[PDB]
C-alpha cells in the first residue's frame, strides 16, 4: 500500500542514505528557518501564542527560541517557535507549494531538548530526521497536480506539514514502521486548515499547529493508538484535502532519491508572499526609467500601473490595511517598491502600508492575467507596465528573483539575512556561533550544544 | 451583516430568557445520556491512552477527569479526555442532520465550570444556556449543506461542526464580546475537519475529544486577542472547504429566536454502535423471533442466505470485521450477532465475541442489497432483512424506526436506566442517583459545583 510505503521509508531511512547535496540544502534551510523564528519572536502573534501556551507546564520541557524564561512542554514549544517562524511569512518555500522547514525544525529542536536519546542525538541524527520530514511533505504534495499551483481550499502547510512533523517526530522517537504508520493516520485527523485565514493573524498558527499536532500524533502512536492502516490510499482519508487525488508509492529504500536533491527551496529577501517577490523584482527594474538620475519617483506623473500576474486571488488586495494583508498584496509590494526603491521588514508596518502616497499609487493599479502566466512558483512571472501622464509607457518582466531556486541566495547572503533577523534577540557571539554550528552541522556530536545556544542571549 | 457576524451576534446575545421549556427538556436528556456514555467510556483503552498522554500537562487551573479522582488536568485536556470517553464506544447521541452534538459541548462546559469558578456562581440555567448555544451553532452549520442530511463522504461531521460548537460554548462561558465570539469561530475553523477514514478505527473518538479541546483553545486565543477572517463562514475557501455544496445562511435575530432542538430531537442509542445498525438490529431481532417461533433458527448451519436491504453507507459495509471499532461500523456483524445471540450488548463488540467461528459462519452468508428508496439519511433509511434456510423457507422482517430514534424516543425511565447501567461501572449507586436527580432538575440548580463535584466519583 501507499501508506505502508511511507511508514517503511520513515522507519528505514538511515544516515547513510543522506547525500552531500541534501545535507547542504537542509543546512541552508535550518539556518534560514532559525532566523525567521528569532525575528518572529518580536511579533504580536508570537506573544499571543506564548501567552496561551504558558498556561501549560511539564517536567518534560523545552525552550522557546531566544526566551530563556519560557519553558514549555515540547508540543507547545514547537507550537510557539513554529508560530514565530511563520509569523511574518518570511520562512522558506518549496515546489510544489508549501513552507516545509517551519513544520519540522521546531519539532526536532523541542524533542532533542526534552527527551534525551541513547546514543545522544547528534547533528547527523538531526539532519536525518529533518530530511525525512521534508521528504514526506514533498511526496504528499506530488499526490496531486493541484498542489503544483496556488491553493484554493486548504492551506498546504496545515495538510502536508502536519504529516511531515509526525514523520520527523516518529524518526526522532525511533518508532517501528507499524507505529510510524499509526502516527501518519493519527496526524491525518489533525490536518487541514482552510485558506480563509491566510492574510490574517491566524495564518502563522497553521505552521505552529502542524508542528504541534505532528508531535501529538507521534506521541499517541508511541502509546499504542491506532488509526486507518490505508489512510494515504483513500479518497476519504488524506485524499479529503485534495480535489483530484492521485497518490503513489514511495521509492524503495534501496538507492533512495530525495526530492530536495532535484528541487531546491526558495528563500525570501523580504517578509511577504513568495509571488510578490516577482512583483518586487520587476518594479525595482522598471523604476530606473522613472527616476532617471533623480532617485525620486514622479508619483504625480504616473497615470496607470499594470501588473500582469497569475490569477492568485488571496494575493489580490488593492488596499491592504493590516500587515498580514499587505504581505498578501501584489499591489502594495509593487507600489511600495516604486515609491521607496526597496522592500524591507518595516515596509509591512501599518504606518507604511497606509501612507497617503502609497494609497495614491494603489488607486492607479490594474491587474491583467496573461494566459501563459500559470499560478505555480515554478512557472509564473510578473510583467509591470507604468504609463505616465504624457502617454509614455515603460515595461519590465521578471521571470525570477534573487532567492528563488533558479537564482539561489549565496551562503554569504543567507548568513547576512540570518544576522539581520537574529540580532534583534541574540548577541553577536551567539549569532556567529549558530552560523558556524549550522554550517558544519553534520560534525556536531551533541545537539544540546545547538539547543542551548538557541535560548540566548 | 454577514453570516459570520450573525453567528457571533447570536452566541453573545442569547440569554436564559430565550430558552424554551422544550429545549430545556431535550437538553437535560442529552446531558444525562452523554454523562453516562462518558462514564462508561472511561473503561476503554482509547480513554486510557488519551489520559496517559494528557497527564504530562499541568496548569494552575484544573478540572476533573470523569470518574477518576486521581487525575486532574488543564480544562483543555480534561475536555479532550472526557470527550474521548464520550465517543470511545460510538454510544453517544446523534442528531439530524448527522452528527454527535453533545460530546463536543458538555465536557467543555463541565471542565470550564470547575476550572474557572465564577461569582455570581455558574447556575444550572447558565449551563443550559451555554450548552444549548453550542448545540444550536452545530445544527445551523449542518444546515449549510443538503449533503449533511446524508451520511458523510469526506469529513467526519463532529470534527467540522463540533469544533465550532465547542468554540461557541466556551465563548459563552467566558463572556466574550460579540467580536471575540466571531474571532473564536474563525480560529476554530483552522482547527476543524478530520477525514472520514479514521472512522471504524481507534482514532475516531479523538474527533470528538479534539472538537471539545480545540474549541476551548480557539476561545482562549480569541480572548487573548488573536484575529482571523471576519467572514470565515461566508466563504467557500473558509468553512465551505469542508462541504461539497456550501449554502450558508444568516441566523435569525435574537429578538425572535427559535432553537433547532425545538423542532428536531436527538436519537439515543441502545447499544454502542453506528446509529444505522440500530435499524438492522431491530429488524434482525424480529426475524429471529419469527425463526424461533417456527423452530427454524437452530441449527445455525441451516441458514443458507441472509440479505440486508440497507442504505448505501459504505463505511458501515464491513463483511468481515475483526476489531471492536470495525464491528461497531458493520451492518453485517450487528445482524449476525443479533441472530446468533438474541440481543446486542456492550460485550457484543469485544473481539472474542466478534471472531467466534459461529459468527464468521453467519457473516459468510450475508449479502447487501441497496434499494433505491433507502436513502442514506437517518430521517429516511430503513432495514429489511431476509433469512433463507436450506429447505428454501424465507423469513423477512423490517424496521422503519427503532426505539431510541427521535420518532420513537426513549422514555425518561428507560433513558435513566441506560444511564444507571453505563455509570454504575465507575460510580456508586448513591452518586448515580444524585446525578439523575440533579440533571432532571438542572434549571433549579444554583451552583454547578454541586454537579461537577459529583462527576469526580465515587
Ligand atoms: Na487547496
Ligand atoms: Na479528494
Ligand atoms: Na489594462
Ligand atoms: Na482539519
Ligand atoms: Na466546498
Ligand atoms: Na419489524
Q: A225 and B210: CB-CB below 8 Å?
A: no
Gap between the Cα atoms of B162 and B233, Å rounded: 15
List the one residue out of A27, A257, A51, A20 whose CA is nearest residue A138: A257
Separation of CA A240 and ligand 1 centre (Å): 10
Q: A73 and B60: CB-CB below 8 Å?
A: no
Number of DSSP helices (H) and strands (E) in chain B, helices first: 18, 6
Phi, psi of A448 (to 5 degrees): -60, -25
Q: Decide if B250 contacts B6 (C-beta within 8 A).
A: yes
Tally Cβ neighbours within 10 Å of residue B310.
27
Q: What DSSP designation does A91 have?
A: S
Q: Which residues of chain B does A202 touch, with a Cβ-Cβ cutoff of 8 Å?
A: 186-187, 190, 226-229
Q: What DSSP designation does A149 have?
A: S
List the one residue out of B160, B162, B161, B120 whose CA is nearest residue B16: B120
Separation of CA B171 and ligand 6 centre (Å): 45
Residues B450 and B340 in one domain: no
Rounded to the nearest angstrom, the minimum Cα separation between A389 and chain B is 39
Q: Which residues sit opposite A57 in a β-bridge?
A: B58
Question: CA angle at residue B269 from B267 to B272, to 5 degrees?
Answer: 145
Gap between the Cα atoms of B138 and B158, Å rounded: 9
Q: A228 and B57: CB-CB below 8 Å?
A: no
Separation of CA A200 and ligand 5 centre (Å): 20
Residues A393 and A408 in one domain: no
The closest ligand to the CA of A365 turns out to be 3
Q: Which residues sit opposite B403 in a β-bridge?
A: B405
For A304, left (φ over 0), alpha (ψ -120 to 50), or beta?
beta
Gap between the Cα atoms of B305 and B391, Å rounded: 11
Tell me the count of A-B CB pairs closer than 8 A: 174
Exposure on the CB side of residue A112, measured as CA atoms within 13 A: 26
Residues A30 and A120 in one domain: yes
Q: A193 and B196: CB-CB below 8 Å?
A: no
Residues A393 and A414 in one domain: no
Residues A253 and A284 in one domain: no
B63, B190, B201: best to mutate for the A interface, most A CBs within 10 A: B190
Single residue among A384, A402, A420 that ends a domain in this structure: A402
**Closest chain A residue to the Cα of B206, Cα to Cα:** A189
Residues A47 and A128 in one domain: yes
Q: Which residues of chain B does A228 touch, with a Cβ-Cβ cutoff of 8 Å?
A: 197-198, 200-201, 203
Gap between the Cα atoms of A71 and B413, Å rounded: 52
Residues A59 and A147 in one domain: yes
**Closest chain B residue to the Cα of A313, Cα to Cα:** B237
Residue-number span of the structural domain to which A379 is assigned: 269-402
Rounded to the nearest angstrom, the minimum Cα separation between B61 and chain A is 8
Residues B418 and B387 in one domain: no
Q: Name the residue facing B189 among A60, A185, A197 (closest C-beta).
A: A197
Q: What DSSP designation does B175 have?
A: T
Residues B429 and B372 in one domain: no
Gap between the Cα atoms of A340 and A351, Å rounded: 14
DSSP string for residues in A238-295: GGGG-SS----PPPPSTT---GGGTSPPB--SSSS-THHHHHHHHHHHHHHHHHTTT-
List the one residue out of B334, B341, B344 whose CA is nearest residue B310: B334
Single residue among B403, B427, B447 that ends a domain in this structure: B403
Single residue among A402, A431, A447 that ends a domain in this structure: A402
Residues B332 and B389 in one domain: yes
How many structural domains does chain A have?
A: 2
Experimental technique for the deposited model: X-ray
Q: Which residues sit opposite A183 in a β-bridge?
A: none
Gap between the Cα atoms of B451 and A116, Å rounded: 43
The closest ligand to the CA of B279 turns out to be 6
Q: Name the residue facing A188 among B56, B154, B195 (closest C-beta).
A: B195
Gap between the Cα atoms of A56 and A78, Å rounded: 13
Q: Decide if A195 contacts A153 (C-beta within 8 A).
A: yes
Residues A432 and A415 in one domain: yes
Residues B322 and B364 in one domain: yes
Residue A140, classed as helix, strand or coil, is helix
Q: Decide if B252 contacts B7 (C-beta within 8 A).
A: no
Residue B99, class by beta-carbon neighbours within 10 Å (0-12 exposed, 13-18 middle, 19+ buried)? buried
Gap between the Cα atoms of A426 and A419, Å rounded: 9
**Closest chain B residue to the Cα of A218, Cα to Cα:** B53
Resolution in A: 1.7
Amino acid at each position: 500500500s501507499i501508506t505502508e510505503s511511507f511508514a517503511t521509508a520513515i522507519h528505514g531511512l538511515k544516515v547513510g542514505h543522506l547525500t552531500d547535496r541534501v545535507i547542504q540544502r537542509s543546512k541552508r534551510m535550518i539556518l534560514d528557518t532559525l532566523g525567521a523564528g528569532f525575528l518572529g519572536t518580536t511579533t504580536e502573534v508570537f506573544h499571543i501564542a506564548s501567552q496561551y501556551s504558558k498556561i501549560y507546564s511539564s517536567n518534560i520541557s523545552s525552550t522557546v527560541w531566544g526566551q530563556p524564561d519560557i519553558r514549555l512542554p515540547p508540543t507547545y514549544a514547537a507550537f510557539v517557535n513554529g508560530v514565530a517562524i511563520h509569523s511574518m511569512d518570511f520562512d522558506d518555500t518549496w515546489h510544489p507549494a508549501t513552507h516545509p522547514s517551519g513544520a519540522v525544525l521546531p519539532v526536532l529542536t523541542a524533542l532533542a531538548e526534552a527527551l534525551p536519546r541513547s546514543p545522544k542525538f547528534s547533528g547527523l541524527d538531526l539532519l536525518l530526521a529533518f530530511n525525512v520530514g521534508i521528504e514526506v511533505q514533498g511526496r504528499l504534495l506530488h499526490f496531486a497536480k493541484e498542489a503544483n499551483d496556488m491553493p484554493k481550499r486548504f492551506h498546504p502547510p496545515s495538510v502536508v506539514g502536519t504529516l511531515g512533523s509526525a514523520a520527523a517526530a516518529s524518526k526522532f522517537l525511533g518508532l517501528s514502521s507499524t507505529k510510524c504508520r499509526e502516527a501518519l493516520a493519527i496526524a491525518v485527523s489533525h490536518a487541514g486548515a482552510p485558506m480563509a485565514n491566510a492574510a490574517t493573524q491566524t495564518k502563522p498558527l497553521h505552521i505552529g499547529n502542524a508542528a504541534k499536532h505532528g508531535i501529538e500524533a507521534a506521541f499517541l502512536a508511541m502509546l499504542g493508538l491506532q488509526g486507518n492502516k490505508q489512510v494515504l490510499d483513500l479518497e476519504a482519508g488524506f485524499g479529503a484535502f485534495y480535489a483530484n487525488y492521485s497518490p503513489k508509492v514511495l521509492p524503495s529504500i534501496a538507492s533512495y532519491s530525495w526530492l530536495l536533491d532535484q528541487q531546491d527551496v526558495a528563500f525570501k529577501r523580504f517578509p511577504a508572499h513568495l509571488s510578490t517577490h516577482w512583483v518586487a523584482d520587476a518594479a525595482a527594474s522598471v523604476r530606473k526609467h522613472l527616476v532617471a538620475e533623480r532617485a525620486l519617483l514622479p508619483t504625480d506623473y504616473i497615470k496607470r500601473i499594470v501588473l500582469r500576474i497569475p490569477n492568485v486571488q488571496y494575493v489580490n488586495r488593492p488596499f491592504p490595511v493590516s500587515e498580514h494583508e499587505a504581505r498578501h498584496s501584489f499591489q502594495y509590494v509593487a507600489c511600495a517598491m516604486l515609491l521607496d526603491g526597496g522592500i524591507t521588514v518595516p515596509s509591512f508596518h501599518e504606518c507604511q502600508i497606509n501612507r497617503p502616497q502609497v494609497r495614491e499609487l494603489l488607486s492607479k493599479v490594474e491587474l491583467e492575467y496573461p494566459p501563459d502566466n500559470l499560478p505555480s512558483f515554478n512557472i509564473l512571472y510578473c510583467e509591470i507596465s507604468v504609463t505616465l501622464k504624457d502617454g509614455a509607457t515603460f515595461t519590465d518582466r521578471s521571470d525570477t528573483f534573487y532567492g528563488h531556486w533558479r537564482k539561489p541566495l549565496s551562503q554569504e547572503d543567507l548568513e547576512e539575512k540570518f544576522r539581520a533577523n537574529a540580532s534583534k534577540m541574540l548577541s553577536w557571539d551567539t549569532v556567529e556561533s549558530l552560523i558556524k554550528i549550522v554550517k558544519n552541522l553534520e560534525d556536531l556530536e551533541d545537539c544540546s550544544v545547538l539547543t542551548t545556544l538557541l535560548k540566548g542571549p
